[PDB]
């Protein structure tokens, strides 16, 4: 089991971001449930 604090970077329009490992995350950094953040981009199922 490995836990790593990493820097994450996102470019406009901020529909995805990358980690220091080079792994992409195909979700907006600003995705959420409040203030209309549920309209932000996600490429993953809701259970993820």
């Amino acid at each position: 089991c490995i836990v790593e604090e990493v820097d994450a970077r996102s470019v406009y329009p901020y529909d995805e971001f990358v980690l220091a490992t080079g792994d992409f995350v195909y979700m907006s950094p600003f995705y959420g449930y409040r203030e209309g953040s549920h309209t932000e981009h996600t490429s993953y199922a809701a259970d993820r």
């Binding site: 970077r9 996102s10 470019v11 990358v18 220091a20 080079g22």
Partner: protein, 48 residues
């Protein structure tokens, strides 16, 4: 009586010409984006 030249009204035959020197000016270095900024604009740095 006796007078000084300051006691006599003075009119001028001279035509005025007021030439002033162009002043020194300093040009500071100025860049819109530093090369560090240009390097950092990439999302993923392969070397890092």
């Amino acid at each position: 009586h006796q007078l000084s030249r300051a006691d006599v009204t003075t009119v001028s035959t001279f035509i005025d010409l007021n030439i002033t020197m162009l002043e020194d000016h300093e040009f500071v270095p100025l860049e819109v984006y530093t090369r560090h900024e240009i390097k950092d604009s990439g999302l993923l740095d392969y070397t890092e």
